[PDB]
RNA sequence: GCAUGGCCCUUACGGCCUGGGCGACACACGUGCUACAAUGCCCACUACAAAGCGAUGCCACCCGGCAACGGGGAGCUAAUCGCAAAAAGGUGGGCCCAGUUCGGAUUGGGGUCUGCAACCCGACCCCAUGAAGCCGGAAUCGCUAGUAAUCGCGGAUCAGCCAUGCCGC
RNA sequence: GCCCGGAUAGCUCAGCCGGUAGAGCAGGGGAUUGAAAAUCCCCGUGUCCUUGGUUCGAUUCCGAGUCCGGGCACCA
RNA sequence: UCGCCUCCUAAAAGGUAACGGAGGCGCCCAAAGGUCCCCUCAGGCGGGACGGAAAUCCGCCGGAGAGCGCAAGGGUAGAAG
């Protein structure tokens, strides 16, 4: 999924946060 | 997508708002392709840059949250020709 | 008149977003509807949807009219 | 011997069956000028399609060729 | 247990089912489903006529879903196809409209395999 | 019971008496005539018909349509002696209303657009003659039943002459227009 | 990059500026990234690194917002503060073999942030779309050990970033 | 008339005892070579002669029909 | 070239030749037949969603120029369409 936007990987991957892998 | 600002350059802005003081000829060229299409400004006659030379845009005024660039495509293209390899 | 092939005929209800509407009559009930919301005849219309949101507010009627250029 | 009216034409020279060498092929305006002028070479080229060595070469042919009409 | 037009999904979880609605994501969808007392768990052959109407209204009358939607688009795209938009006359083209590059890719938006090599 | 009824028989009726008018209960502007070709999208029939045009179309006016079909030869477009290529419907007297007023004023619009009704398209005798995008959008929907964007040219046939005095019917009607 | 012999231009082949272009697109190839799924995916919870980087910088902790961010605001000249939290793992639940809760392209729409300015041409967030791909022809590349494979972390450049690159852990 | 055989891509032809249509030529891409030939791979092209049948399904099976081909009849 | 059909040559009845002029036939239709009942065209000009300059529509104007399976002629809407 690491292109899944809206995932925990697709975030992770990004190097972002957001509604689907809060800061914590 | 820009923020709570609205962006128009302020001279191109100004001879578009005092001619709204009377109003008359479309000859307006400016090369702010960079601004928003004049909102308080529906029916002139704009003469944006296209790097090459200047493409009046009748701007109706469907087209307002736009750029005065999005209306002169700065690129010519008009199909391919030929390819050729062994090179 | 013609027996069988036509449609049913009956009255339902022509809802509206804006106050009721044109009389029951032809063969829906439910429906978007929206008769004009604005009418559209000369003017009472054009409602334009072009809007810019918050108009007005900023870059407004400012940076200083014409001024004396006469001089 | 002289032409009448101006002409434009391009001069090929394709050699590439085997793969010796290979070839030179080019393009030129020609036309007519008051009488007794001569001969005049017109260089006009772009961002260099041609080498600035290979240039005379084409002229030495052009006006050489020219000899006989 | 047809929603916002013909989609009856059923032997599949309501939050994943909804999905096939077009306008209903994971997203929207388990918001509905929390907003209407149902739990998703449960497969839609089991919903109650209570809470499929109970949903069903909801769903139908919140945003505009399936066809209704479809329309939108369309309109939205042909309007900017108007005095000369840039990214109109980059649906017009067939191309990407969002900046990419074309030398290379854009196959989603172009033919598979064009060929055509002088 | 009518909708738009009363609208002519109690409003416009009068305005025209005087206005223009006089003398005569008959010769006032009044419609007679509403006929509605398809001809069938951006493709017509062929063999495996389409007839949904038909079937659906019928009752978006309440009433089924007929089926017209071409004549003479074709050669560049397809078709020959004809057969089918048509299905259109006519129909008068209370249709007409119901048909155009319960969609004359809520129908019409949603269709996302601009101004109003094409002006200089009268003639004489005043029968006008829009003809929307086709486009079947709207009004009485009810989705599905989806399979070509289909929909129409609307012919409407009116008693009175020139154009004013048929202008003056439809536009103290209902009739949004001038660009 | 620089330096340098010779040749060449000196109201321009030098200089300034606004705008464009280097981002074009019928096509071909190279290096890669993300995949086609169950030894997998998604969600909640819970662990164990290393090497680096930070004052008109890293920014705890609060609060509004679903988010990106925004207001406030402590500490930190940093083995003393923080960028962190590592991910794969572990545990509980969900999916049940389908072009799917696999895959995310593409597109519409609504926002955020940097900067004078993001039409050409930025990066993020959110809703809605959700494509090709269920394993790849002739061919062809890498690696002999803490290597390959796989998982994440840092840095230079840098306002921001098209980094899926590069040098490292 | 009688028996037997044949018609499949623009041409040349396989089609196996029912499901799907393919080699070859030509051309277009690739691959291999330091490079050019030679060689390899991948593409796009069908009323499967026409008709009725049989079958869930026919280019294939069955019956007829036309046009070829082979042999033998014979033609008021 | 050789039989058949249409027009002309053929000199206003019929007929009339030439290696005279110009085209067709060697079928077809179970509805393209019988009868009963309805219907009227082609184009010209308007007005018309895709619509060529003829798709199908609507309004006038239009005695036949349309149509009648195929050549040509005759005939024909007061129908043979
Ligand atoms: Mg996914
Ligand atoms: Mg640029
Ligand atoms: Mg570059
Ligand atoms: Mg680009
Ligand atoms: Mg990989
Ligand atoms: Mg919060
Ligand atoms: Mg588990
Ligand atoms: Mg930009
Ligand atoms: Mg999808
Ligand atoms: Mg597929
Ligand atoms: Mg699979
Ligand atoms: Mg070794
Ligand atoms: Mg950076
Ligand atoms: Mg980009
Ligand atoms: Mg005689
Ligand atoms: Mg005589
Ligand atoms: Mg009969």
């Known amino acids: 999924g690491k292109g899944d936007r809206r995932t925990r990987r697709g975030k992770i991957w990004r190097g972002t946060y957001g509604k689907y892998r809060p800061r914590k | ?87 | ?71 | ?69 | ?118 | ?179």
């Open chain 3, 1 to 71: 008149m013609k027996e069988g092939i036509h449609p049913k005929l009956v009255p339902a209800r022509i809802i509206c977003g804006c106050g009721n509407v044109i009389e029951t009559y032809s063969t829906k009930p439910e429906i978007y509807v929206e008769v004009c919301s604005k009418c559209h005849p000369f003017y009472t219309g054009q409602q334009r949807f072009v809007d810019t949101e918050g108009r007005v507010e900023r870059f407004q009627r400012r940076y200083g009219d014409s001024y004396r250029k006469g001089r």
């Open chain 5, 1 to 118: 247990a047809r929603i916002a037009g013909v989609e009856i999904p059923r032997n599949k979880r309501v939050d994943v089912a909804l999905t096939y609605i077009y306008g209903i994501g994971k997203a929207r969808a388990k918001e509905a489903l929390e907003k209407t007392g149902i739990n998703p768990a449960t497969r839609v052959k089991d919903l109650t006529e209570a809470e499929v109407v109970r949903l069903r209204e909801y769903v139908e009358n919140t945003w505009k879903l399936e066809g209704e939607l479809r329309a939108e688009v369309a309109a939205n795209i042909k309007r900017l196809m108007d005095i000369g938009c840039y990214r109109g006359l980059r649906h017009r083209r067939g191309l990407p409209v969002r900046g990419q590059r074309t030398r290379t890719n854009a196959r989603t938006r172009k033919g598979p395999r064009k060929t055509v090599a002088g």
């Open chain 4, 1 to 69: 011997e002289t032409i009448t009216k101006p002409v434009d034409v391009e001069g090929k020279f394709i050699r590439q069956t085997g793969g010796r060498g290979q070839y030179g092929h080019v393009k030129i305006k020609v036309e007519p000028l008051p009488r007794g002028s001569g001969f005049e070479f017109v260089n006009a080229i772009v961002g260099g399609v041609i080498p600035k060595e290979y240039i005379p070469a084409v002229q030495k042919g052009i006006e050489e060729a020219m000899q006989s009409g």
């Open chain 6, 1 to 179: 019971d009518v909708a738009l009824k009363r609208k002519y028989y109690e409003e416009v009726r009068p305005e025209l008496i005087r206005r223009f008018g006089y003398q005569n209960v008959w010769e006032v502007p009044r419609l007679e005539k509403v006929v509605i070709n398809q001809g069938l999208g951006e493709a017509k029939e062929d063999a495996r018909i389409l007839e949904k045009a038909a079937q659906e179309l019928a009752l978006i006016t309440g009433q089924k349509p007929a089926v017209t079909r071409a004549k003479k030869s074709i050669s560049n477009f397809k078709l020959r002696k004809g057969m089918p290529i048509g299905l259109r419907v006519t129909l008068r007297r209370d249709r007409m209303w119901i048909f155009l007023e319960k969609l004359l004023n809520v129908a019409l619009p949603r269709i996302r657009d601009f101004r109003g009704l094409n002006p200089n398209s009268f003639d004489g005798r005043g029968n006008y003659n829009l003809g929307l995008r086709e486009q079947l959008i709207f009004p009485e929907i009810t989705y599905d039943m989806v399979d070509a964007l289909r929909g129409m040219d609307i012919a409407v046939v009116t008693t009175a002459e020139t154009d004013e005095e048929a202008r003056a019917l439809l536009e103290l009607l209902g009739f949004p227009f001038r660009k």
């Open chain 2, 1 to 87: 997508s820009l923020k709570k600002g609205v962006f128009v350059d302020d001279h191109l802005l100004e001879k578009v708002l005092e001619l709204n003081a009377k109003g008359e000829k479309r000859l307006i060229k400016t090369w702010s392709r960079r601004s928003t299409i004049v909102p308080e400004m529906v029916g002139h006659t704009i003469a944006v840059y296209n790097g090459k030379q200047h493409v009046p845009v009748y701007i109706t005024e469907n087209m307002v949250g736009h750029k005065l660039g999005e209306f002169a495509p700065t690129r010519t293209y008009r199909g391919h020709g030929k390819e050729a390899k062994a090179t």
